[PDB]
């Protein structure tokens, strides 16, 4: 279960671009300021391996 990938980003990444950012992503519904809630969630996951 250690293998990480990203579900949400403000734009798609460029050729051989990379992004270390964790954050809580906000879908414009509320400025949730680094804590989860309705329409705002942590954007990294790891697989159900």
């Amino acid at each position: 279960y250690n293998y990480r990938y990203r579900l949400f980003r403000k734009s798609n990444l460029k050729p051989f671009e990379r992004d270390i950012s964790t954050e809580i992503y906000q879908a414009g519904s509320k400025p949730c300021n680094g804590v989860e809630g309705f329409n705002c969630y942590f954007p990294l996951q790891s697989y159900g391996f």
Binding site: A27, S29, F38, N39
Partner: protein, 49 residues
């Protein structure tokens, strides 16, 4: 909920944009994209129950 029937919603405009913003239920989750992305889509019908 284990044994009920379901039927198509069709030929009328999918309010998924308002359905994404609205806290109309205690939780929601999706097989395809987020509801804001579903607000850009179409189908012959959505089967529902």
């Amino acid at each position: 909920v284990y044994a009920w029937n379901r039927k198509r919603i069709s030929n009328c405009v999918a309010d998924y944009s308002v359905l994404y913003n609205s806290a109309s239920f205690s939780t929601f989750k999706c097989y395809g994209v987020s509801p804001t992305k579903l607000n850009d889509l179409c189908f012959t019908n959505v089967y529902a129950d």
